[PDB]
Amino acid sequence: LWGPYREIWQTVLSALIKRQPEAVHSLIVLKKYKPDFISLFKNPPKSAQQHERVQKASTEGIPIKGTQRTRILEEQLIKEAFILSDLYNIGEIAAVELLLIGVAILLYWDGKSCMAESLLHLIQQGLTNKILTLISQIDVNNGNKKHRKEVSDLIKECQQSLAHSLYSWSCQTPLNREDTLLLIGYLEKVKVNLTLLMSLLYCLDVGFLEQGTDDREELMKQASMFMDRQYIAAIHNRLQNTQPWKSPGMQATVRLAWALALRGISQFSEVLEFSEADEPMAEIAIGGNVFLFLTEAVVGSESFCTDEFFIRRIHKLVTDFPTLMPMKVKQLRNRAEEDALRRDLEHLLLLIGELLELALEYWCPTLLSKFVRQMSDLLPATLYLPYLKMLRGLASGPQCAHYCFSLLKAVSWDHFFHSLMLYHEHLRRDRGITQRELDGLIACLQLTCTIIDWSESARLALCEHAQWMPVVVILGLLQCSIPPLLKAELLKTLAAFGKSAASLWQSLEYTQILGVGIEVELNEIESRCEEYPLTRAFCQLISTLVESSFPTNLGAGLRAPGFEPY
Amino acid sequence: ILCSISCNSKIQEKIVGDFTQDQNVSQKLMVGFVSCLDSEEVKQTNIRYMTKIHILNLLITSLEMKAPNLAMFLLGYETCLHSILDILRKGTDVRAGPVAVWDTPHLAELCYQVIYQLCACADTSGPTMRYLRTSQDFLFSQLQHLPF
Amino acid sequence: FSSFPSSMDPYPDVRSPRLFPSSHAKRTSSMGLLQSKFASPSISRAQGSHSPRILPVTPWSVPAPLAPTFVI
Amino acid sequence: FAAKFVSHKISRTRWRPVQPDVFATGSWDNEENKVCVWATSDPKQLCDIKHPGDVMDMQFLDKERIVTGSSTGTVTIFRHHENNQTLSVNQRWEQAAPCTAIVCSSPEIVSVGERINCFRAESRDVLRTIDDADSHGVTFLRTTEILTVNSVGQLKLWDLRKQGNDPTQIFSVTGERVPLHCVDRHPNQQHVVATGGQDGMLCIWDVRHGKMPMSLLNAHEAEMWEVHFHPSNPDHLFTCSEDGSLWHWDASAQLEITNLLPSSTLSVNSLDVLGLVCGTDAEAIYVTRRLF
Secondary structure, X not given: OHHHHHHHHHHHHHXXXXXXXXHHHHOOOOOOOHHHHHXXXXXXXXXXXXXXXXXXXXXXXXXXXXXXXXXXXXXXXXXXXXXXXXXXXXXXXXXXXXXHOOOHHXXXXXXXXXXXXXXXXXXXXXXXXXXXXXXXXXXXXXXXXXXXXXXHHHHHHXXXXXXXXXXXXHHHOXXXXXXXXXXXXXXXXXXXHXXXXXXXXXXXXXXXXXXXXXXXXXXXXXXXXXXXXHHXXXXXXXXXXXXXXXXOHHHHHHHHHHHHHHHHHXXXXXXXXXXXXXXXHHHHHHOOOHHHHHHHHHHOOOOOOOHHHHHHHHHHHHHHHHHHOHHHHHHHHHHHHHHOOHHHHHHHXXXXXXXXXXXXXXXXXXXXXXXXXXXXXXXXXXXXXXXXXXXXXXXXXXXXXXXXXXXXXXXXXXXXXXXXXXXXXXXXXXXXXXXXXXXXXXXXXXXXXXXXHHOHHHHHHHHOOOOOOHHHHHHHHHHOOOXXXXXXXXXXXXXXXXXXXXXXXXXXXXXXXXXXXXXXXXXXXXXXXXXXXXXXXXXXXXXXXXXXXOOOOOOOOOOXXXXXXX | OHHHHHOOOXXXXXXXXXXXXXXHXXXXXXXXXXXXXHOOOOHHHHXXXXXXXXXXXXXXXXXXXXXXXXXXXXXXXOOXXXXXXXXXXXXXXXOOOOOOOOHHHHHHHHHHHHHHHHHHOHHHHHHHHHHHHOOOOOHXXXXXXXXX | OOHHHHHHOOOOOOOOOOHHHHHHHHHXXXXXXXXXXXXXHHHHOXXXXXXXXXXXXXXXXXXXXXXXXXXX | OOOOOOOOOOOEEEEOOOXXXXXXXXXXXXXXXXXXXXXXXXXXXXXXXXXXXXXXXXXXXXXXXXXXXXXXXXXXXXXXXXXXXXXXXXXXXXXXXXXXXXXOEOOEOOOOEOOOOEEEOOEEEXXXXXXXXXXXXXXXXXXXXXXXXXXXXXXXXXXXXOOOOOOXXXXXXXXXXXXXXXXXXXXXXXXXXXXXXXXXXXXXXXXXXXXXXXXXXXXXXXXXXXXXXXOOOOOOEEEEEOOOEEEEEOOOOOOOEEEOOOOOXXXXXXOOOOOOOXXXXXXXXXXXXXXX
């Protein structure tokens, strides 16, 4: 029936293109394989049997739904069928319908894939009850080596699909809202988490914010006919720090993200003391590594089918945190970090950005208070080092990156360029500078590179703005003794100018004139070097330049073929 | 790249032996090709469309030059040849008024041009016509699915 | 595509008005005659003999930093 | 492995800068010390160099020039004008005691004695002279650092780049048993180095990773002779011993070392192999030109 499921999927896809039920309804069969879709990838009763013993039939004969197949059940077929039963813990006659239809194991996999895929597409109480069973079945399931690898890939696909189906059930409303504690606890028991994190965020941000269900009265004086607000309050009280709560750092993060949302759901301070019902519980979460977990998630960000949606959710979460929590931001940085902060916050912002909801958030950011905050960041060197990363995170979104750049601008870039020239001069007078200060500069140049590439106008401004003096400063840094991260950010800067050729080629020629030095650099590279991390960026820059049209004038000074030697 | 390699020169007898040195590997490759051919009966779909455009062009551009060659051994001539028949006798090139979907008759044309070369040549007309007259039906299956 | 390249070169609009921008144009290594005529007019503004010999010298070198010197 | 009797005990062999096809050779120990360029591949004695003075240093100073160092620590270099078959003797210095090895740092032909006289590219005046007596290891670890290895096999990183006359560092074995015959410095990275023990051992070295004796051996029989290494496969190399012997230690393979060469003869001359010889401690006559 796997082929039939595939055929149904095509019809569903056809409906999708047209936005109409028509393809599904113009092909009946949905209302035929309907409990097969509800059962999902479970084969829950027809696992391996000894009453279904295929080869003990002395006439070689088996029955299905309806007709029978005595003269075709020859000994080669018997062996493919028992190979299925031993391999997968599957009923023997079921394994035979799976060889008759369509390689039988592959067909069975397709049937699991087709139904699951169809469900995911649709999303994009048997079924709600069957999620747990499906999860359990997968756990039970968990040239030969290649086959094993293929099985592992299939398992990964299963752990990747279903993730969409579970998300969709949250979006449609069906698993709300008493299934939170069961979802959270299961997650605590458990990179697969990123499906889970993606699921949680929206629910905190909308479904647990103001929807809720009006039922689930597990207590008689806690809730009444309207459980909406009553459950929000019950979750708030339920959520706490405990002695082994610091080992599930994932639960801490999800619990903090609730407090972030919960701050905006609270109409006023009438019921709730802020300095017992928010600020300690959020602080206690901060001291349990919740912010670190978000950074880890950003590090773990990876392209997924629902991945863009997950990124949008992350952007929404970031918006919730700058929006409703600046007291916590100020408490951490402006009092506890400096004394014992802002840099950490900037790093977190960059992380979130890198991980189009994010773009929308960047657009929203795109004011006087924000400018004051930027000035404060510029004041302290550490604070300034947070700001560039934050700006790039705005930079990462395609709408967002341009918008983020505009927000940073509304001057600052020129000041950064001046610092680079000044910093370079200081270095010359004196990787020849405090590690925290150098890392700051790496972040300045990394925010610079990102903002230039993302927006054509910004890149153009960087390329040809006299005050900034980026091309010359970069060259001086390169010439002076310097660190590998720093030389990489010079090349990322050069990329903007490249995208903006004669000007670049002339500069290259000037550098060559200022190549014995280049040969020496190559020799140094051969001697080293820090694991080749520096090599790739330079190679990429060379490739972009090559993409740019060649100039006859360049290489003129050397005889005959200046372009060729590079 | 197999098309450019196998349409530049007259195929050497040594190469087939080298290919079959593994013995098992050639068979595995043939099985994989058959699976790819059968896989029909959106990025993945796009890839399939591209692969079909390439693979079918490679088999045609090799085929025009002559036989036997690498393609003949990969059709299981001393199978994938039956998969070409199996895909043809299942193909539905009409969707009930949303038009004959022009990718699908193009797929049928690419399968048929191989069969046409394999009944015109002396080498292949004897075996190919013999296996087109046995089950699974050739003339009967195509006249079943042919639309007006 | 040469015409397109010329248009792109003219698209820079570096400053108004400069023989230095004319040199920024010669960066491509191709120079319009009109510029040469203008240079000749400037030279005109024994002198003729020098121009004849100077022009020949300019003709001898087409390499970068040579045209600028010839122009000077 | 087409052998060829020169009937001349060879001391030098270069796959010339120009595969290992242009052979040149320098024949010491004869009554008018010998060297031939373009020989032989096929007689091709285009530049069978009539020459007083023997061959201490030797370098293909271009694809049409030839540098060398002469027997008394003198210096000798011509320009191998292979078109017109004559040449012009470029470098002729008197008292640069012979030199013990030959190094390079382009194009200052650095070397060591068994005192340093840094001549260089067109530097017909002896420019640098860190006249430090040496109690035969010579290379460019980085320009223009070097490491003098005295006949206690006693390596010591010095320079000629900055001023000074000491060494900057020193590599040393626990016992200094062998003398300065044959050390190694890897083209895989110019901070990677080894040596060959004159018992038949290796002596592998780590610059960055401490300074320990990394890898000895016990494989060859006699003094460390010289090693054929592939000029592009850094790892591929094979070992030898000072009767002229050669044990193929397949080091791009893992110890796969066998009776390699056309063996059992007297000694071998000097090493250059690309695409050949690995000259012994005693430099007799031998040949084979099939190095692929």
